[PDB]
Amino acid sequence: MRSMQGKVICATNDKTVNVEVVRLAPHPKYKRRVRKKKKYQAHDPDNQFKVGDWVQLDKCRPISKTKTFLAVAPEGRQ
Amino acid sequence: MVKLRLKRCGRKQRAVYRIVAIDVRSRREGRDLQKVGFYDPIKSQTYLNVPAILDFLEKGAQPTETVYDILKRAEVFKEF
Amino acid sequence: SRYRGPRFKKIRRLGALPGLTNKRPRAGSDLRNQSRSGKRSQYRIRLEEKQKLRFHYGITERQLLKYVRIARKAKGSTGQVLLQLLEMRLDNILFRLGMAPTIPGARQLVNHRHILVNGRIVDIPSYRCKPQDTIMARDEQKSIALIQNSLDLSPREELPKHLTLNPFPYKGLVNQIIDSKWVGLKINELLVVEYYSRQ
Amino acid sequence: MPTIKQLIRNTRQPIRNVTKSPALRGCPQRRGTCTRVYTITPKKPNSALRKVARVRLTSGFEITAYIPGIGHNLQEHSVVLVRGGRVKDLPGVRYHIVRGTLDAVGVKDRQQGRSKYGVKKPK
RNA sequence: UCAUGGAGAGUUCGAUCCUGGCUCAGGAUGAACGCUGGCGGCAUGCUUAACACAUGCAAGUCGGACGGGAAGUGUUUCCAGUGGCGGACGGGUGAGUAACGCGUAAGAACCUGCCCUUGGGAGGGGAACAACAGCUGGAAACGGCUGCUAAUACCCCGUAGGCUGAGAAGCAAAAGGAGGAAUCCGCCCGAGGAGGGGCUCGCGUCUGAUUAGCUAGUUGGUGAGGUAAUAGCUUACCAAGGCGAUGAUCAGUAGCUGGUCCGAGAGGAUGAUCAGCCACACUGGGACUGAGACACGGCCCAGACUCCUACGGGAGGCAGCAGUGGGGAAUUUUCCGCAAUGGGCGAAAGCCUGACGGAGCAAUGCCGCGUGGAGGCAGAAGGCCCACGGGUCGUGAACUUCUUUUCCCGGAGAAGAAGCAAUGACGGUAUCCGGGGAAUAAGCAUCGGCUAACUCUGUGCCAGCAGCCGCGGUAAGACAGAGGAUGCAAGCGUUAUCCGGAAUGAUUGGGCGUAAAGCGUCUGUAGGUGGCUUUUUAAGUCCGCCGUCAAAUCCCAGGGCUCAACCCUGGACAG
């Protein structure tokens, strides 16, 4: 499927980043496009992500309870 | 494995049977990957769909008794 | 049921029900009171188009709801298609061929199993005929000439264009579904259709 | 109520069709035990002596139910079968009592509309 | 062309317009009660107490794995026991579970007996444990020493495209049986596949802020362990994280979905039978074996409860099918059969299946059919009403003929059953033929407006009716009766629950001067919306193609039951 690109929130954990993922969604009964945020824990053995950078989440083998993704880099076609 | 078997599909005193290749652990009226065949024992046709029965028998889903007997009426059996 | 009942009441109330239950016009010695004086609610008018239809074919009203649901369910003029699903009713055809004088006469004439259709017997008056059918007597009916009595007294009115009566071999067939002009009874389809809008 | 955010919070919801019989709370009609068989008067425009049985039910409530028809057999501690339906004239009477059912006889000598009163055919 | 869909009425007031609420007309029930009740076809049949349960049955099988013994007199049938699979499927219920449990859609870290394909192997030894014989304990349930025995049962050595490890090195298996043979069923080690499972994740998944903080194996990291496999799965230490005003945590409710019902539509309510997934099996908690359970009819323990006891102890789990008792308004027979279908075992023969196939009762529902057809002087008998002339019951009946769906009395008589024959609970059922005979068969609501149907007698604010308005104090089209009429029809009504109507929670579709409603006004955070031109990516958007959304249902078109209901075959828009 797709990746889930999104900003890094706070990386005060080794090999671990929280990521806000912003997702538009049609609200069911009323027809707008409401955003919903959902933040994840991603893995990086390199841990080369500061606060505020934005990554892409890809499914991998689960590392902990929450850490079920590792994020590498977006493509960046502007 | 899968066991190609009939299932009763009709009213009371009717016996319109499908030939379904479901897993043998299921109840007799369950769900199939592909419901291949038909058998109407009162008097009507029997659509068979030969390539799919050759797919499953080529895989190795053995049939039951009278499904095998329907398969012995027609010349379905080729070992390829 | 059948309603099996007093029927000049229904002819005085609904107006003259054509052919059904009489060729004799109503009130040969009657009607000498009961001024209507012109007050009739519109619901009474639409209700009298229900029962002008329901008694003229002898239907159960629940079965008439059934025919309206099929008539909506088909594509086209539901005011006409209701009078196609109630013309190709079998005992209406045996009435219309003159195989019986009245429609209870035809309904009873098909209850006691006197009609072969395409060589097979049909025991049920609500059978809906098709184009290109075959409607005959029973083999005993060349010895039981009740049908020939009805065909004797009948032929004032001829036939509408679906029928083809063969004289001695007693076979009647319908070429195609009956046209609205073809329908014998005179009534407004819209009045009846509007009435069932409520359900 | 804009389409944006006063209404993808919520509009509001209407409550229910509020129950027009707080007892009978499973389903339609329920066995009863007679406690009082007294008689009360309606509101001001009418004038009658309407005869109601205050009745304990098998549900867990106690409720004053009306007794239809003309004659009534209902003494103390008999068994009835109450049903819903609001008698307007009486404040508090919410329910009826079925006649012709268990331990509440049919009405005396009625030949018009008997299925509402539990009287078998004459003739 | 598309369109197959949208109805109003009553009630505030002396009247009028309006807001607004209530009530009705329409469908649907797993329904209940009342009155009435001919048949047939197909469905449905504890919604409540996941409440106890009498009795029988619901899971066996294999002697072609093995040893014994027990009927029959070389020959066969059985059998408790050790083994082999099956008891994890099928059946039942929805208590819990607001959660990857479910639905849908992806993924990698796994397992997998029976089932197909495929590469190789089965030498050698050995010890017992049941059974059994003896003694003996117990009322039973069960045992306990003493010896003995066999194997596809156990153990050891060698050998292995496997495993461990960086390599070095090591480590690991087998079973025979049937047959004269032929061969077949097996066994052990690998390698795939199908199907079945175990996990993980995106999204969807009820209300309540008069519940605002929660969480310390908690959220991460490493090391050690552990699991079939990843993992705080577990443990020691380190880091302080993680969730939340877009509702965390708590409380309450609820099995979920294909679907059902309604609605014009958007969608609202709901999850019976049919089908898929989950959970439970008296209430709790454990583990064992196997491929697979923390196992409904397995084991062990605790708790409560019932039965037996000879008083020491035992035995038990109907939310399996029938059934009893209780609760309830209310939900059936302690039935027949493995003939089919589907399971399990077996080489086969066959065996066992309360799954399933049928039958019985119940108008519980949907559909079909009958209670007569045609004529009937317009003359009589009668009820009710009448300006006493008559009218109306009424072609209705009486009466004359025709017919026999059904009814009775007889005959015949299926397929369903599968090419070796035989093999049917249903059942002499379905269906057909013959002989009488209109014979055996119509009720229930309503008649003041909505709402079709109305006059008369009795009652006199009484008895009563009533869905809302309201009728009822002497001539009541509203109560009670009769006549008549109306609508329905083997049904008719009332009630309850749900949707409609209801634009009365409003996206389609409402409002806020005075009718219910603008915060007292202002600053501003989060958040929402946003000027113009040019360029870029395409997340939204649109188009093509592809995958999937099980089957059943709904829609179209065919086909089958004499039609319909129902069943079946094929197809597909939506989304």
UniProtKB/Swiss-Prot annotation, chain A:
Recorded GO cellular component terms are: chloroplast; ribonucleoprotein complex; ribosome
List the Gene Ontology MF annotations in alphabetical order.
rRNA binding; structural constituent of ribosome
| Signal peptide limits | none
Look up keyword Plastid and say if it applies. Answer: yes
Subcellular location per UniProt equals: Plastid, Chloroplast
Record keywords:
Chloroplast, Plastid, Ribonucleoprotein, Ribosomal protein, RNA-binding, rRNA-binding, Transit peptide
Q: Which superkingdom does the taxonomy of this entry point to?
A: Eukaryota
* Gene Ontology annotations of biological process type: translation
Q: What family is this protein classified in?
A: Belongs to the universal ribosomal protein uS17 family.
Assembly notes: Component of the chloroplast small ribosomal subunit (SSU). Mature 70S chloroplast ribosomes of higher plants consist of a small (30S) and a large (50S) subunit. The 30S small subunit contains 1 molecule of ribosomal RNA (16S rRNA) and 24 different proteins. The 50S large subunit contains 3 rRNA molecules (23S, 5S and 4.5S rRNA) and 33 different proteins.
Q: What's the stated role of this polypeptide?
A: Component of the chloroplast ribosome (chloro-ribosome), a dedicated translation machinery responsible for the synthesis of chloroplast genome-encoded proteins, including proteins of the transcription and translation machinery and components of the photosynthetic apparatus.
- What this protein is called in its record is Small ribosomal subunit protein uS17c
The species this protein was found in: Spinacia oleracea
Give the taxonomic lineage as stored in the record. Answer: Eukaryota, Viridiplantae, Streptophyta, Embryophyta, Tracheophyta
UniProtKB/Swiss-Prot annotation, chain B:
Pfam families recorded:
Ribosomal_S16
Where mainly located? plastid
Q: Give the protein's recorded name.
A: Small ribosomal subunit protein bS16c
Query: What does it do?
Result: Component of the chloroplast ribosome (chloro-ribosome), a dedicated translation machinery responsible for the synthesis of chloroplast genome-encoded proteins, including proteins of the transcription and translation machinery and components of the photosynthetic apparatus.
Give the record's keywords alphabetically.
Chloroplast, Plastid, Ribonucleoprotein, Ribosomal protein
Q: Could you tell me which species this protein originates from?
A: Spinacia oleracea (Spinach)
| GO annotation, biological process | mitochondrial translation
The regions listed as transmembrane in this protein's record are: none
GO CC annotation: what is one?
Answer: mitochondrion
Swiss-Prot record, chain C:
Query: Keywords on this record?
Result: Chloroplast, Plastid, Ribonucleoprotein, Ribosomal protein, RNA-binding, rRNA-binding
Location comes to:
Plastid, Chloroplast
Tell me which PROSITE patterns the record gives. RIBOSOMAL_S4 (PS00632), S4 (PS50889)
On subunit structure and binding partners, the annotation says: Component of the chloroplast small ribosomal subunit (SSU). Mature 70S chloroplast ribosomes of higher plants consist of a small (30S) and a large (50S) subunit. The 30S small subunit contains 1 molecule of ribosomal RNA (16S rRNA) and 24 different proteins. The 50S large subunit contains 3 rRNA molecules (23S, 5S and 4.5S rRNA) and 33 different proteins.
The protein here is known as Small ribosomal subunit protein uS4c
User: Pfam families from the xrefs?
Assistant: Ribosomal_S4 (PF00163), S4 (PF01479)
Q: Which organism is it from?
A: Spinacia oleracea
Domain of life from the UniProt record: Eukaryota
InterPro entries attached to this UniProt entry:
Ribosomal_uS4, Ribosomal_uS4_bac-type, Ribosomal_uS4_CS, Ribosomal_uS4_N, S4_RNA-bd, S4_RNA-bd_sf
Q: Name one GO biological process term.
A: ribosomal small subunit biogenesis
What molecular function terms (GO) are annotated for this protein?
A: rRNA binding; structural constituent of ribosome
Q: Where is the S4 RNA-binding domain?
A: 88-148
- Record's keyword annotation contains Cell membrane: no
**Role summary:** Component of the chloroplast ribosome (chloro-ribosome), a dedicated translation machinery responsible for the synthesis of chloroplast genome-encoded proteins, including proteins of the transcription and translation machinery and components of the photosynthetic apparatus.
Q: Which CDD domains match?
A: S4
The UniProt entry's GO CC annotations, sorted and at most eight, read: chloroplast; small ribosomal subunit
State the residue spans of region: Disordered.
14-42
Its family remark reads: Belongs to the universal ribosomal protein uS4 family.
Matches recorded under SUPFAM superfamilies = Alpha-L RNA-binding motif (SSF55174)
Q: Which residues form a coiled coil?
A: none
Curated annotation (Swiss-Prot), chain D:
Q: What else is noted?
A: Exons 2 and 3 are cis-spliced, while a trans-splicing reaction is required to link exons 1 and 2.
Output one GO MF annotation. Answer: rRNA binding
Which Gene Ontology BP annotations are present?
Answer: translation
This protein is called what?
A: Small ribosomal subunit protein uS12cz/uS12cy
Q: What is its main location?
A: plastid
Entry keywords, A to Z: Chloroplast, Plastid, Ribonucleoprotein, Ribosomal protein, RNA-binding, rRNA-binding
Listed under subunit, the entry gives: Component of the chloroplast small ribosomal subunit (SSU). Mature 70S chloroplast ribosomes of higher plants consist of a small (30S) and a large (50S) subunit. The 30S small subunit contains 1 molecule of ribosomal RNA (16S rRNA) and 24 different proteins. The 50S large subunit contains 3 rRNA molecules (23S, 5S and 4.5S rRNA) and 33 different proteins.
